[PDB]
Amino acid sequence: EIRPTIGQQMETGDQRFGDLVFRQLAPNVWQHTSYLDMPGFGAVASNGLIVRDGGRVLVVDTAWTDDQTAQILNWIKQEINLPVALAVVTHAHQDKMGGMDALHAAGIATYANALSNQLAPQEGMVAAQHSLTFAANGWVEPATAPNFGPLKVFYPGPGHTSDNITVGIDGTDIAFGGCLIKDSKAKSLGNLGDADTEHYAASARAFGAAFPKASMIVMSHSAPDSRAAITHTARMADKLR
Ligand SMILES: CC1(C)S[C@H]([C@H](NC(=O)Cc2ccccc2)C(=O)O)N[C@H]1C(=O)O
Ligand SMILES: [Zn+2]
Ligand SMILES: [Zn+2]
Ligand SMILES: [Zn+2]
Structure with a gap:
C-alpha cells in the first residue's frame, strides 16, 4: 500500500494496479494516480483523468514516467477494453507530460497548448x-480540438505556469484544474518556480467562472474537492501579489 509524502492517501474506493492507483469518480470518469519517489523525501502523487466517451477513451495528463503511463494504458485495456482516442496534457512539467513517449508508442494522438509544445524541449x-x-x-x-467529445479545454491565464490549461468534463459535474488548483485545506500553492504570481489569482478565478456548475474539482496533488478548492486557491494567490 502506497503512502505518499505528498498527495492524497489511499481511501475506500481506490484500486491499486501495479504501481498506480485508480479511483472511479463517475460512471464514465476515473482518476489515475502515479507516484514519483524523491530521494530522501518519499513519494509524490500526481493525478490525471480517464474518460469513457461511447466506444472510445480519452486521457488527461500522463503519469510521471513512460513506464507508469504504459501501466495506465494497461489498466484501461484490462478494465475498459476500449481504444484510447487522444490525450490532452495540461502543461510542460514532468508530472503532466513525463510519459509522452508511452502514448506515442501506443499510437495515441496527443494534444497540448501550443505554448506547452514550445516549452517542452526546454523542460526536458x-x-x-x-x-x-x-x-x-x-x-x-x-x-x-477536433472530436474532443466531452473534454472542454479552457486556458485560464498564467498561474502555476504560463502554459497551464484546464479541462471541464461535459455531461458531468467534474472539472479538472491540474496543478493550477490546490485543495481547500492547502497551506501552499506548491512549486512557484515557474509561476506568474501577479496573475495567478485571476486565472484561478477564471477557471471557476469557465465551469461555474462543476461541483467536483479534480486536481494534480489532492483528492477531488468542492469548489472551495478554487476559492481557497484564489485567496492564497491574492497574497502573492
Ligand atoms: C510541487 C509540485 C507537486 S512538483 C510538480 C512539478 N515538478 C515536476 O514535475 C518535476 C519534478 C520531478 C521529480 C520530482 C518532483 C518534481 C512543478 O514544478 O510544478 N508540480 C508541483 C505543483 O503542482 O505545485
Ligand atoms: Zn507544473
Ligand atoms: Zn504538480
Ligand atoms: Zn521550468
Whole structure:
C-alpha cells in the first residue's frame, strides 16, 4: 500500500494496479494516480483523468514516467477494453507530460497548448503531436480540438505556469484544474518556480467562472474537492501579489 509524502492517501474506493492507483469518480470518469519517489523525501502523487466517451477513451495528463503511463494504458485495456482516442496534457512539467513517449508508442494522438509544445524541449519534455490554441477569453479554438467529445479545454491565464490549461468534463459535474488548483485545506500553492504570481489569482478565478456548475474539482496533488478548492486557491494567490 502506497503512502505518499505528498498527495492524497489511499481511501475506500481506490484500486491499486501495479504501481498506480485508480479511483472511479463517475460512471464514465476515473482518476489515475502515479507516484514519483524523491530521494530522501518519499513519494509524490500526481493525478490525471480517464474518460469513457461511447466506444472510445480519452486521457488527461500522463503519469510521471513512460513506464507508469504504459501501466495506465494497461489498466484501461484490462478494465475498459476500449481504444484510447487522444490525450490532452495540461502543461510542460514532468508530472503532466513525463510519459509522452508511452502514448506515442501506443499510437495515441496527443494534444497540448501550443505554448506547452514550445516549452517542452526546454523542460526536458517531448512535445505533443498537436497544438491547441486559445481565444482572448481562454476558450480553446474548436478547430484545434477536433472530436474532443466531452473534454472542454479552457486556458485560464498564467498561474502555476504560463502554459497551464484546464479541462471541464461535459455531461458531468467534474472539472479538472491540474496543478493550477490546490485543495481547500492547502497551506501552499506548491512549486512557484515557474509561476506568474501577479496573475495567478485571476486565472484561478477564471477557471471557476469557465465551469461555474462543476461541483467536483479534480486536481494534480489532492483528492477531488468542492469548489472551495478554487476559492481557497484564489485567496492564497491574492497574497502573492
Ligand atoms: C510541487 C509540485 C507537486 S512538483 C510538480 C512539478 N515538478 C515536476 O514535475 C518535476 C519534478 C520531478 C521529480 C520530482 C518532483 C518534481 C512543478 O514544478 O510544478 N508540480 C508541483 C505543483 O503542482 O505545485
Ligand atoms: Zn507544473
Ligand atoms: Zn504538480
Ligand atoms: Zn521550468
